[PDB]
Design a protein around this ligand. Structure first.
Ligand code: CHL
Ligand code: CLA
Ligand code: CLA
Ligand code: CLA
Ligand code: CLA
Ligand code: CLA
Ligand code: CLA
Ligand code: CLA
Ligand code: CLA
Ligand SMILES: CC(/C=C/C=C(C)/C=C/[C@@]12O[C@]1(C)C[C@@H](O)CC2(C)C)=C\C=C\C=C(C)\C=C\C=C(C)\C=C\[C@@]12O[C@]1(C)C[C@@H](O)CC2(C)C
Lengths: 197, 194, 42, 152
């Protein structure tokens, strides 16, 4: 499709068939097809998580700033007390995630093998591509066109960048992200990274 | 009926044997003689654990302490055992140990003299007075049920031992009571992370 | 110019330039950070 | 604290050694004129000694009975940066080097006379290969899983 750097030739193994292909592989990780498939699934799930994470750590801060709800920052959520101890919640999450991730890994290893419901035999998932299960995971039954996949991949990449920026810019300056943006908007020329620390 | 859907079955395990689900990640059953010996050992372990688990559950349900304290009398010199709250007149370490050794050794050596591999797993005859094994139709179902219950009993014994190790001087029943005291506080969390 | 580059690509010359650059980097790091017995960043 | 050791910010032999070194330097400082260059050099040395002692005290080391710091390679969480944190770093860098070298060798195995490329390095291909080692753990793990790490 497009080029990530004009005047540079794209690698041969990247043929533009995959969604969101711009021929960006300077270090040549995806030379073997098996590595390409594994990294494709990684870039999907890694990033599908990141979009939710970024929205969750950003939107409550804005809502709190404008004043509807009073919620602790994304850092101080762990220090807060909940109805149950953190250990029990961690154990529940560990067991459930073990189950679901082993199901997904089995699907990736042997496509079209774990579609059948173990408990209720009649229900099943319609056949499709790996990484896009569809079916019950798509209640509204949207169209899985290539454009939607490209939009999802671009949003996921932006989410990666947003999360890395959030974490590092909190590490350098203890202030929150939205407050950092507001401080920069107060006076751009005196509040950038270079001017302060 | 595989243990993990989407995973190929091993060659030597096709599903003919009762309670076979094609589970062998380490490939220990390649040698047929080793497979038969493993079947024997598994059946014996299952039977012993099945006989043992009620022997832990019924005590500590009455006023008697638990499966650990009932073992502490042998540590004290000159101690005497008790049964149902009554001290056994013949309770002392040397006689008890000698009787156990003689009886168990004779029984086990009698067991080991059988030659037919099938007759070792399922002797039949005089061992079953009721005679549930005459009809071959229900034999496979009964064998599968026995294997599954024995595996469950083995897991129960593992849980008992691990719970005892985590909390010294604690029985399974009081552990269940403590867990039911507050389900959201007394779980595996406090021992898995300090 | 081709043979000049070829000679400058020979093993001893490339090795001495590489080692000189590495020694300069180590020297400058040791001057900027005087002495250190442990890693205190984390 | 550990193995009968004393924290380095509480021991007295540390301060005694610092005083001895400072006095030794100041004895030589007196000889020259206060405004002369050797005086400036000796003042810089004294400042460096004081800063080093303060940093060693603040970093949480453990002096021994005789007064010197002791390193703990045991694995305690209070000494992560004593052995374990640097060591991993080393491995990373070390792995880099090895990986790069291996790659270059393969890159010259195709030609008919690789000896000429071994004794006279080429800069373009080497520069292409050099930066591929920044992600060496991932490529090495993928090659190990695939099975191309070991000859057959
Ligand atoms: C998904 C990734 C994830 C990440 C990156 C973090 C990251 C963080 N958590 Mg969180 N957590 C995460 C998931 C989870 N946390 C917790 C429960 C906690 C607790 C109980 C605590 C943290 C704390 C912290 C901070 C620890 C920093 C440090 O070690 O010094 C750091 C911001 C600490 C905090 O509140 O501030 C330091 C804290 O003590 N987290 C659970 C439930 C088990 C999680 C489940 O996925
Ligand atoms: C988080 C992991 C991650 C992973 C596994 C992938 C995976 C992939 N990417 Mg994606 N990508 C990501 C994040 C990721 N990406 C981000 C954040 C961006 C925006 C900057 C992009 C933007 C992008 C473009 C523009 C292109 C790809 C393409 C590819 C494919 C080939 C390159 C490759 O082998 O990468 C394997 C990568 C790794 C193993 C990750 C290693 C990360 C190291 C440890 C740290 C990086 C340092 C960091 C700054 C700190 C592969 C499916 C190419 C394609 O053809 O897609 C179909 C392509 O042209 N990606
Ligand atoms: C993707 C994972 C994710 C995770 C792990 C969390 C995690 C957390 N959220 Mg966030 N959140 C997310 C996405 C996520 N959020 C999204 C997509 C939104 C919509 C914008 C929110 C909006 C949100 C609200 C409105 C609140 C939380 C709060 C919390 C905490 C309570 C969780 C709960 O009770 O259930 C927990 C630390 C609650 C809290 O009190 O935080 C301290 C709470 O008030 N979250
Ligand atoms: C907004 C970004 C985004 C986009 C464009 C897509 C796009 C796609 N998804 Mg993915 N997906 C995402 C995020 C996204 N996804 C996240 C976060 C998860 C994890 C929960 C998944 C998990 C997932 C699964 C499990 C499946 C898909 C599938 C699909 C396809 C059909 C659904 C659809 O058309 O979406 C269009 C999306 C939008 C119009 C976004 C609307 C905005 C929402 C409401 C925001 C809610 C956030 C709010 C602030 C809180 C399409 C290629 C299905 C598929 O491919 O079937 C064949 C399917 O199987 N996705
Ligand atoms: C994805 C877009 C993105 C955006 C819009 C922002 C936005 C913001 N950043 Mg963050 N940041 C990001 C990603 C992003 N960041 C990433 C990837 C990193 C890791 C290097 C950082 C690390 C970072 C630091 C260290 C600091 C900020 C700060 C800020 C603010 C000042 C901007 C500036 O001076 O340099 C921000 C830009 C960069 C350092 C590099 C470019 C980031 C990508 C490549 C841009 C596209 C601004 C609100 C500054 C602040 O605190 O504001 C008051 C500050 O000190 N950011
Ligand atoms: C399978 C092996 C097994 C073994 C080795 C033991 C071993 C033990 N049992 Mg348990 N028990 C078992 C199964 C077993 N039990 C089963 C299946 C039941 C259910 C009926 C019980 C119910 C039980 C009770 C009700 C009691 C024991 C007691 C004891 C101890 C006293 C032994 C003795 O004095 O008997 C000699 C008995 C004779 C009548 C000789 C003939 C001894 C540690 C005693 C205990 O709790 O100690 C405080 C006791 O009171 N057991
Ligand atoms: C056979 C079924 C079984 C059952 C019903 C129980 C039941 C109980 N266990 Mg035990 N346990 C078992 C086996 C079992 N265990 C095994 C095999 C081990 C060794 C890992 C343990 C080790 C253990 C520990 C370390 C602890 C308990 C505790 C408890 C109690 C609370 C459970 C908890 O919070 O998380 C315990 C979670 C797990 C160990 C997972 C168990 C899942 C089982 C094994 C699944 C197989 C069952 C079958 C297929 C259905 C509860 C009464 C907790 C207690 O102290 O309560 C106050 C406690 O801290 N158990
Ligand atoms: C090989 C790499 C190398 C690198 C990265 C640096 C890097 C640096 N040098 Mg050093 N330096 C080097 C070799 C190197 N030097 C050599 C070979 C000499 C001998 C001529 C010097 C002599 C030198 C002087 C005389 C000065 C620096 C200074 C500096 C700084 C420049 C801004 C920076 C810390 C400057 C500085 O920071 O001084 C305080 C300075 O004035 N360097
Ligand atoms: C080019 C990379 C390279 C690599 C990957 C290896 C790999 C290995 N070496 Mg070999 N080795 C090398 C070069 C290399 N060696 C050189 C140049 C020499 C002569 C000094 C040796 C002499 C040697 C001995 C005597 C032994 C090994 C052994 C080993 C094995 C164990 C690791 C270790 O002990 O390191 C030992 C490492 C060294 C003593 C020094 C290596 C440092 C060199 C200088 C770095 C490579 C730089 C090179 C010039 C880069 C050029 C590439 C560039 C043009 C792009 C391991 C398979 C050990 C063994 O047999 O294990 C089974 C062992 O007994 N090696
Ligand atoms: C998944 C992810 C983040 C997930 C975050 C989550 C779930 C956060 C959750 C929470 O916030 C909530 C909701 C609420 C809080 O109370 C709690 C926490 C827990 C904090 C980030 C990934 C972040 C991933 C990143 C940044 C990856 C970057 C990769 C890059 C740049 C790779 C580049 C290259 O690989 C290419 C593409 C090609 C090669 O040829 C060249 C090189 C250069 C090697």
């Amino acid at each position: 499709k497009g080029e990530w750097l004009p005047g540079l030739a794209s690698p041969d193994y990247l043929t533009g068939s995959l969604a969101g292909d711009n021929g960006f592989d300077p270090l040549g990780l995806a030379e073997d097809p098996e590595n390409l498939k594994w990294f494709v699934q990684a870039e999907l799930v890694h990033g599908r998580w990141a979009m939710l994470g970024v929205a969750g750590m950003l939107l409550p801060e804005v809502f709190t700033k404008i004043g509807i709800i009073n919620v602790p920052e994304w850092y101080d959520a762990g220090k807060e007390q909940y109805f149950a101890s953190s250990s029990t919640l961690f154990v529940i999450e560990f067991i459930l995630f073990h189950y679901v991730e082993i199901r997904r890994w089995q699907d990736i290893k042997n496509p079209g093998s774990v579609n059948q419901d173990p408990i209720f035999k009649q229900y099943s998932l319609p056949k499709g591509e790996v990484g896009y299960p569809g079916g019950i995971f798509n209640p509204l039954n949207f169209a899985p066109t290539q454009e939607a996949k490209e939009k999802e991949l671009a949003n996921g990449r932006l989410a990666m960048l947003a999360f890395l920026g959030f974490v590092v810019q909190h590490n350098v300056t203890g202030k929150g992200p939205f407050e950092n943006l507001l401080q920069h908007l107060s006076d751009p020329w005196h509040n950038t990274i270079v001017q302060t620390f | 009926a595989h243990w993990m859907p989407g995973e190929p079955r091993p060659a030597y395990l096709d599903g003919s044997a009762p309670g076979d689900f094609g589970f062998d990640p380490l490939g220990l059953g390649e040698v047929p003689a080793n497979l038969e010996r493993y079947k024997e050992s598994e059946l014996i372990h299952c039977r012993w654990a099945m006989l043992a688990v009620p022997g832990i559950l019924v005590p500590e349900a009455l006023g008697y302490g638990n499966w650990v304290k009932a073992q502490e009398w042998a540590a004290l010199p000159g101690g005497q055992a008790t049964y149902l709250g009554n001290p056994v007149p013949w309770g002392t370490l040397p006689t008890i140990l000698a009787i156990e050794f003689l009886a168990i050794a004779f029984v086990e050596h009698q067991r080991s003299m059988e030659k037919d591999p099938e007759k070792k797993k399922y002797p039949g005859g005089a061992f079953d007075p009721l005679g549930y094994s005459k009809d071959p139709k229900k034999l496979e179902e009964l064998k599968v049920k026995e294997i599954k219950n024995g595996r469950l009993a083995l897991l129960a014994f593992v849980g008992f031992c691990v719970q005892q190790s985590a909390y010294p001087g604690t029985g399974p029943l009081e552990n269940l009571a403590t867990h039911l005291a507050d389900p959201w506080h007394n779980n595996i969390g406090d021992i898995v992370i300090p | 110019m081709r043979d000049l580059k070829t000679y400058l690509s020979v093993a001893p010359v490339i090795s001495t330039l590489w080692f000189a650059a590495l020694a300069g980097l180590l020297i400058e790091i040791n001057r900027l950070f005087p002495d250190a017995l442990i890693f205190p960043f984390f | 604290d550990i193995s009968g050791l004393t924290p380095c910010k509480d021991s007295k032999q540390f301060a005694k050694r610092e005083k001895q070194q400072i006095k030794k330097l100041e004895s030589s400082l007196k000889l020259y004129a206060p405004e002369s260059a050797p005086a400036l050099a000796l003042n810089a040395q004294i400042e460096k000694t004081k800063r080093r002692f303060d940093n060693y005290g603040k970093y949480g080391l453990l002096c021994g009975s005789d007064g010197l710091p002791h390193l703990i390679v045991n694995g305690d969480q209070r000494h992560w940066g004593e052995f374990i944190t640097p060591g991993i770093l080393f491995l990373y860098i070390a792995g880099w080097i090895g990986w790069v070298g291996r790659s270059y060798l393969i890159a010259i195995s195709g030609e008919k006379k690789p000896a000429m490329k071994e004794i006279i390095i080429d800069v373009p291909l080497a520069s292409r290969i050099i930066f591929r080692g920044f992600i060496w753990p991932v490529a090495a793990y993928r090659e190990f899983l695939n099975g191309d790490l070991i000859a057959k």
